[PDB]
Paper text:
The Notch signalling pathway is highly conserved and plays key roles in many aspects of development and homeostasis. Canonical Notch signalling involves a simple cascade, whereby ligand binding induces successive cleavages to release the Notch intracellular domain (NICD) which translocates to the nucleus and directly regulates gene expression with its binding partners (Kovall, 2008; Kovall & Blacklow, 2010; Bray, 2016; Kovall et al, 2017).
To determine whether the Drosophila ligands adopt the same arrangement as their mammalian counterparts, we solved the structures of the N‐terminal region of Drosophila Delta and Serrate as well as the ligand‐binding region of Drosophila Notch (EGF11‐13; Fig EV1A–E). These were solved using molecular replacement of the individual domains from the human homologues to resolutions between 1.5 and 3.0 Å. The conserved domain arrangement allows us to model the Notch–ligand complex by overlay of the Drosophila structures on the earlier structures of the mammalian complexes (Luca et al, 2015, 2017) with this leading to no significant clashes between the Notch and ligand coordinates. In B, C, E, Glycosylation is shown in a stick representation as are the side chains to which the glycans are attached and disulphide bonds. Purified Delta (NE3 fragment) also exhibited robust binding to a fragment of Drosophila Notch (dNotch EGF11‐13), which contains the core ligand‐binding sites. This relies on the conventional contact sites because it is abolished by an alanine substitution in the DSL domain which replaces a key receptor‐binding residue (F204).
Residue numbers in the entry: 450 to 564
The structure:
């Protein structure tokens, strides 16, 4: 009694393996259950942060981030001050999807561009 050779009961192209008196199914990525019938949806753990959208494939997820965020789970608040936008020795303060400049004395404008 091969049991597997009489016809595999595994779904989702899982591999039937004989066990003493029975069988087990070894599933491909993204599936589980005794016969590989359960789809694992990695978005069920709500991995995408900061109002990102979660997209599912077997074995994986992808987050689509709101502006201002990056990383696999949208967990990184991008530092928009990296590019030193505040001119004339201004001080850049990072914001969500933006920055604010505190301008030295004698300068003004969103980026301290005015004198
Ligand atoms: C970094 O400095 C450059 C100019 O040197 C600006 O182009 C960038 O401003 C952009 O991307 C992030 C947005 O939040 C900003 O409003 C936008 O200007 C600045 O990040
Ligand atoms: C999920 O499927 C894998 C792959 O076959 C299996 O090793 C594991 O035991 C399953 N998990 C549960 C909780 O059934
Ligand atoms: C971060 O987001 C930018 C787009 O804003 C993208 O180019 C980059 O690949 C992302 N990095 C990671 C680690 O998700
Ligand atoms: C559930 O959320 C965790 C992160 O917290 C992630 O690692 C899994 O991929 C996801 O299904
Ligand atoms: C998935 O992407 C995110 C960034 C938001 O725009 C959501 O409204 C969308 O459903
Ligand atoms: Ca899935
Ligand atoms: Ca930011």
């Amino acid at each position: 009694i091969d049991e597997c050779d009489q016809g595999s009961p595994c779904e989702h192209n899982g591999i039937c393996v004989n066990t003493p008196g029975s069988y087990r199914c070894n599933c491909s990525q993204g599936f589980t259950g005794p016969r590989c019938e359960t789809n694992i949806n990695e978005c069920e753990s709500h991995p995408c942060q900061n109002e990102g959208s979660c997209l599912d494939d077997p074995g994986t997820f992808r987050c689509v981030c709101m502006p201002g965020f990056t990383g696999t789970q949208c967990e990184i608040d991008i530092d928009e001050c990296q590019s030193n936008p505040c001119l004339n020795d201004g001080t850049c303060h990072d914001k969500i999807n933006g920055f604010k400049c505190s301008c030295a004395l004698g300068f003004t404008g969103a980026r301290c561009q005015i004198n």
